[PDB]
Amino acid sequence: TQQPIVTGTSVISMKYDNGVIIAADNLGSYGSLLRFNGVERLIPVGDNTVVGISGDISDMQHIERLLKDLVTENAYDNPLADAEEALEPSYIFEYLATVMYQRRSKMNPLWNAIIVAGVQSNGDQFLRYVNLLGVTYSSPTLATGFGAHMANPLLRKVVDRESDIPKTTVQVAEEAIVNAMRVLYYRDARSSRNFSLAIIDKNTGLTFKKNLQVENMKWDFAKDIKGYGTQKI
Amino acid sequence: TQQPIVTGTSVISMKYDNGVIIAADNLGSYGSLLRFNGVERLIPVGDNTVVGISGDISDMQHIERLLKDLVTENAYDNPLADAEEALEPSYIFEYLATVMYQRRSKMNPLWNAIIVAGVQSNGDQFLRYVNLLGVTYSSPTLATGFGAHMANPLLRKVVDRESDIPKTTVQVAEEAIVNAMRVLYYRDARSSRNFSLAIIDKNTGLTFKKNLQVENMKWDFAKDIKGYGTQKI
Amino acid sequence: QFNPYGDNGGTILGIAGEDFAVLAGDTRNITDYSINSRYEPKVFDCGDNIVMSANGFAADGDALVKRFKNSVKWYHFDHNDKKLSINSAARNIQHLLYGKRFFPYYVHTIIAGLDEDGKGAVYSFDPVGSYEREQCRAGGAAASLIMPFLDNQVNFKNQYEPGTNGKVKKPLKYLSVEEVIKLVRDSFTSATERHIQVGDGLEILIVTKDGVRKEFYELKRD
Amino acid sequence: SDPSSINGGIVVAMTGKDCVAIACDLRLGSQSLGVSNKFEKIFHYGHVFLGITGLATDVTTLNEMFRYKTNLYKLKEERAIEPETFTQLVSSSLYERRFGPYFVGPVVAGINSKSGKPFIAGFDLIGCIDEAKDFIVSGTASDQLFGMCESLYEPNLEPEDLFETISQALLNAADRDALSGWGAVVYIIKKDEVVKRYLKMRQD
Amino acid sequence: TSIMAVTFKDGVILGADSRTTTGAYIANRVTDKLTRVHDKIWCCRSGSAADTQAIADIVQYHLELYTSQYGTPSTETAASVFKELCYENKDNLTAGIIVAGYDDKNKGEVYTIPLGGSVHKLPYAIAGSGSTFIYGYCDKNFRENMSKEETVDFIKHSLSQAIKWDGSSGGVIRMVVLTAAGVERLIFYPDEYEQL
Amino acid sequence: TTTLAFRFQGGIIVAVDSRATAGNWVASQTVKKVIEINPFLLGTMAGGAADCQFWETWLGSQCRLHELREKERISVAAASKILSNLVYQYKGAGLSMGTMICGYTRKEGPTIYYVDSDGTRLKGDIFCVGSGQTFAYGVLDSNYKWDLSVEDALYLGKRSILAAAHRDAYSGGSVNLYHVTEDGWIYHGNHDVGELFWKVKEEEGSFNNVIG
Amino acid sequence: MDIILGIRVQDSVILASSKAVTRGISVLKDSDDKTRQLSPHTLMSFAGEAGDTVQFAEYIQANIQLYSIREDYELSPQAVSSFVRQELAKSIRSRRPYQVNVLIGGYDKKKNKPELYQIDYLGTKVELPYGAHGYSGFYTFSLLDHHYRPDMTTEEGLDLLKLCVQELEKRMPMDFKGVIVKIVDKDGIRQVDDF
Amino acid sequence: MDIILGIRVQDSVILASSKAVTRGISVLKDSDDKTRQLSPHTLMSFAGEAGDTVQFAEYIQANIQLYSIREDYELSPQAVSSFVRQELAKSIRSRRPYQVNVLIGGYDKKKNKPELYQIDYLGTKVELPYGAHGYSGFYTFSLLDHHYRPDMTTEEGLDLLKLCVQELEKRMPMDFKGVIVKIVDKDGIRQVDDF
Amino acid sequence: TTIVGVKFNNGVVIAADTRSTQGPIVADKNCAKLHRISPKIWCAAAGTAADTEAVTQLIGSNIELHSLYTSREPRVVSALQMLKQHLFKYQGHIGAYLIVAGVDPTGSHLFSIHAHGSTDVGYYLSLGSGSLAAMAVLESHWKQDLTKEEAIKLASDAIQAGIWNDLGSGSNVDVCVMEIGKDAEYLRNYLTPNVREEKQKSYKFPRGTTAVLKESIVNICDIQEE
Ligand SMILES: *C[C@@](C)(O)[C@](*)(O)[C@H](Cc1ccccc1)NC(=O)[C@H](Cc1ccc(OC)cc1)NC(=O)[C@H](C)NC(=O)CN1CCOCC1
Ligand SMILES: *C[C@@](C)(O)[C@](*)(O)[C@H](Cc1ccccc1)NC(=O)[C@H](Cc1ccc(OC)cc1)NC(=O)[C@H](C)NC(=O)CN1CCOCC1
């Protein structure tokens, strides 16, 4: 048992017709202090998987090293490590889910919520969540922290059920993700403007975008709001 | 019942042959934050008394106003208010001690430690302490807070008993007070360099010195101290 | 302080007929007031014509199912591919649950299949491994809403023969698979109306001598 | 310790076609000990019926209080209080004890004598009104009653059908609750007759 | 919250961020924390939103009644009325208030009233959770008798940094300028102040 | 739960109820609270459902191993002591068990041992165990004599559980009845309280507290 | 004050109340009458917290005796029991409640019926053929469910009570030192002296 | 397990041990012998926590009976009591202590003297002319301080015990259901069957 | 609960869901959370249900008396001032969270108020357990210079986000529109997206199924003549 110290907020994600998108801001908070401003919380594994991590950053860095070592170990005595016996999103997820649940069962959790996004060998989209309790679930949209409360409602207006996924393009999905990140910057006190975004497509592969910013923000109506009630000037 | 918020540290004082000296630094701390740097904690009452106050500053400001109103009220219908029926140190003290004990008895203390220094009509030195519990005592030297632990041992080397008071000059006493204030700046984490000092003499009256600084500090030996043990460079 | 348990909601329901059994569960998964998923299956084909659900804290539920599936696999290896009977599964699941008696799996478990005479069987467990065979069981969040309805409509409790004053009970009948699926669908619609953690979808697994079949129905998404 | 489950008990009410029904169990206990088999939880003030579950001392006290208030109402107004008005009076009276509440789950049932409209309402312990068209439930087996009512109920039932439906809702809910049962009473209420029936139920 | 009031040659300026928090949720991102208690006496609010409103409404009432009977109250008088409420109800309130005003006689004045209900007259003051991060910056960059444009810049840069580092501060920067000329309300959006 | 076992002229009577609880929720009305360890040995269950089922089923295995090794049926004394020594190892861990081990051997005669999860082990002629024990004791002790007929003793055991089923909120469902003799145990049926209460009321002229 | 019982038969109410008064490790008294006559045909037994019990009983007694003098008339047992209930219900929301449980046994001369009311410290009232407060009810209610018939005589009622007292003497951990038995019928209240 | 007494007279040790076994609200048994023969001239009575008492007593019994067989010789009461003390002193610093208090009554055949040892669950041992564990000692120690003489006969010792049991039956709140009395002397251990 | 307020060109609109809960159980599927304070001042309620009903009824009563006393139509700022002072006095123990809106001679107004007595002004607001789901929609789709039709759409969309994504909220959408120069229109069950599907079976029992011990006629009437 511990308490999280340096933390990352929401990770948001969704499926679209040919792949998956995942995003997370670049902040490491220290309570209310916005301590570290260049933290990457999307971690690619091969060219078919991105693991998005929220919660304790020291435990995130531990998981980062577990994944890096998993790639090293899968290459051992494996001439098909860059082909049919490459690591899949489902293999990476089950490994992390196993670890998370073992750690909660010894009362020493990894204080994180994790989304594993990717594309399988057969072209299937993979999107699954696991957290510090070892609870796992899958859905067309997934989000951690504040993202669950604010991003999911927006992302579900685009993909409300399994049948909506082939109808959704990468342009529509990315726009919904980028909009959701702005809403989180408006409303989450432990969020930042700067973020990273990754698309794993079955045709174009892994695209990883760094140093995105929330843009086109409405603040202008603020000048008309005065006092809390009766104050006119 | 409350807890003190903005606080003042030690007040130190002693008797000498013809009068009394009292001093206190000019800081209002806010926990570990050294928030306010020009706070006067020596408050003169007439030309024969100085009340030195440590502890909660909001309660100090309340006491300041009680004393100011006491002077106003003593002048009412009193043609001898600037002479035989002027307020004495003993009158001011008993008033404060009465209030402090009443307030502790209602479980709503004034969160302070107070030293009333002065000279009576007959030339007698007055020096007495009272705190949030209504505990009162007198001694040739008196100090609050850290001052009790570090100032008193130094001041008692000069005036160790009643018989040492006529042997002690204002020059010797002021030097001891000024030295004690330096020691407190060295060693008390909630102290400041800037302080005020007041002398109430039976011949020369009230002298009130503002904007004193701790000076002639030994820091030079610091350059020779390296590591915590075995580290040579 | 770290709390190793959570509550993922949902509800499950097992009913046994003469030559079949059903195990139904909603497909909603929740924590607090959020929906995690509208379709996360909770009822599983475990092999040897046995279906299983472990409803409550989903991590414990998934661990338990995973271990029982593995138990079935090793039963085959160690006893010459012999079929694990439903009574034998039940006893095995008791030992899995009671193994964690002092750090329990936070779930209510139901298994369904056919007994060794081909008759429908529902077995039902508490979190630490006490069990009973029944015609009838609901587990999970809306169990308190659903069980009394099942007592009334499956075992005909408090129903008497009209005009017998009140001295001849309604006699017990097995129900057809069509009649059971009606009670299941109504049970879940009723629970969805009144329980916030129940909704989204209903997945029913039906077990006969010919194997395991699935049916799915939409439930209200609010 | 928890005052809403020391004594046990349940009340349910349902609307049908030009009729209402209200039913309760008869148990009064001290936790595991059943004490009385005759503790009715349904009262009437003229043609307005009130069921009360929860702490039995407050059930009794509130009955006496509403008898008092409706007696005075009738003397001053020169007519019997109607269910919509009595519902507001229950709410007012519960909310005036907001920070030292009566530990009760009241249920109002009756037919407006002018408009003929069937009426039921439920409340929380501090007076929030739940005015429902179908049914109202209250007590230690409220979860169980909600489940029975939500599946068994259909609109516009005739008095003698509604009787079967409400009785089966009560009986089967009570049997899954340790602190409810030990007998039951069902009032069937039409505009100008009220039949009261004691049910045979399991005595454990 | 991040709030400050700064005296300068022609008067005093008050500044504030616009974020209201409910835990980690931002209940209001365009809050107005600068509130008028008299024509040229304003205050910055930090701590409990309910407590500081209740206090500010009472002070506004006291000063309107002062005005009817005795004419225009001084800034010191306004601060005294805030203090009385904060000090006497210290057990039940969480209010950190900065009071700022302009007289023709006294020019611009700033009084800060922290948690315990003490009063402190200062050339400038900072308060709220975000103020911790700018004590160093503000001490190094404040001078007396700055121009209006200098003071606007000092506050803009100061609250910029408070907002950058404090998660409980954000949104727009609002300012109120108090001089003989009158009352000027300013606003500064993130796209201006972030890139400083 | 209410369970009872008593010794009389014609052997041992064992009677239990069939209710399971989860607080005030009635988990079941049809639970088996007697284990038939062997044809001459019975175990009764009260307390934690899982604790009772698991450890008394385990007890049966240990009794079976005794007769394989020693070519002889285990004594009631020895069987009860396996269970009591077991629960004593777990003492303080939070096991909840109240059990009666009832049986016949040649060397002992008809014998009843009370065993509970705090490690108490007692030989005796009469025991009632569980949340409803006092209700059962009231009826049982009032009408008990050494020399009841087998028919009257069966009825008293049945009547005593019914008494508890009625008054105790945490007992009910049905009455499972056993008779243990020289020749082993004999089942005397499951008796649903739904019908048994009203039958007994009418025939006996008792339960005048009830609206009937 | 541990055991108080009441049983109502054809034409009388019988109250049985234990004699022990115990503080900590010592039985201070073995002849305590846990009862007050409220009116000539109404008797109240009581049990609960030390001090509270007698103070409450005597307070009620004073009030009923006052009513009697003012109206030259005896309140019905139903009326006395409602008054007592209201006092306990008022008490439960006070700064310090009376922690007192009572049985009220009365003969109503107007209806020519015996009546027994069981009231707990919360103001929970019930009329019963038989009643008990505290742990005694865990043994006695089931006993009487079996052996009680509504048309019993006073002497049959006393034997039925002997059966109750025997069971409590067998199974209860505390030595309650026997009971004082009193009968309320049409001729008033009398104490059975040998039990 | 509440009351255990011991008194040592001229030529014997008498142990008296209550018969009740009580869990919560019910007396489960009224004929319980709270004693084990450790050797032919040594008897141990015991009281304390449910389960712990019998387990401890039987464990000690097993060990003394083992010593007897190995050496074909009976340990002196002093030796048995020291062994028991060490076991309790070892126990008190364990993960879960035995919560058991004991009296050991023995006749030492080598010295031709009776001996009575009182040992509590901490391993606190004392040899005494008379002893008691639990609340009984609050009444009995003062009784025996008055009435005990060192040169009493066995029958005088039994009357002195009747006086103790009478006082406990008068003043203690719990019904302990009488006592089983056993005498340890030069001819071994025997039970007085009528008390 | 999900409640929202949206300002538009000539007025303000408020909306609410219709679910009330008791623990995880739905107590009422069609409550009215839109409370009338005065004819043109309405508020949406979240929090402790009885407290919201009592607080709006009390302030509505006192607003009516104030309106009669002054011969003026009531202002939203008066409703707000009375609500804030009442709620502040009870230190959060009266758990009412309200979106207060209306039109009066001064114009159109939109406020929120919390249980502890803090108030806010806005062009768009949301409260209750579904306020985050609703605020996500409002932050994505709100613009200045909204028409009446656009504002009703936005408000009901924001409630729907609450209905679908928040377990605390469900059933139906209620709206009230307060436009300058016009009567306030209260749109009870404006949307009804959660009608229960047809049941598979009727559970109507055969008459006589339930065993009865006794019957009797209950006397409800007064004491009779002759
Ligand atoms: C740094 C910040 C943003 O917190 C600053 O101090 C704000 C000042 C402000 C906000 C709005 C209008 C005017 C001035 N304060 C807040 O945003 C406060 C933070 C706060 C909450 C509670 C306490 O309690 C001692 C102190 C500070 N936010 C609120 O007051 C919000 C509206 N209300 C709540 O969070 C509900 N509280 C929670 C704690 O218990 C009391 C009720
Ligand atoms: C009177 C009664 C009903 O309690 C009687 O003793 C039952 C005997 C019995 C015997 C065999 C099978 C089923 C029932 N016992 C129960 O119904 C128990 C009561 C009980 C609950 C909890 C504890 O906790 C120490 C002791 C006794 N009921 C259960 O065991 C229920 C079905 N299950 C649980 O309460 C689950 N919890 C999980 C956590 O660990 C404790 C058991």
Ligand SMILES: *C[C@@](C)(O)[C@](*)(O)[C@H](Cc1ccccc1)NC(=O)[C@H](Cc1ccc(OC)cc1)NC(=O)[C@H](C)NC(=O)CN1CCOCC1
């Ligand atoms: C989404 C939701 C359900 O929370 C929304 O806020 C509802 C608003 C509402 C407004 C007017 C009429 C009806 C409903 N609120 C409720 O349904 C509340 C939720 C609630 C429960 C408990 C607490 O406890 C602090 C706060 C809010 N439900 C109730 O108030 C119900 C009817 N009553 C109770 O749960 C019993 N109360 C709870 C509060 O303490 C007194 C007893």
Ligand SMILES: [Mg+2]
């Ligand atoms: Mg639902």
Ligand SMILES: [Mg+2]
């Ligand atoms: Mg029941």
Ligand SMILES: [Mg+2]
């Ligand atoms: Mg029962």
Ligand SMILES: [Mg+2]
């Ligand atoms: Mg910020």
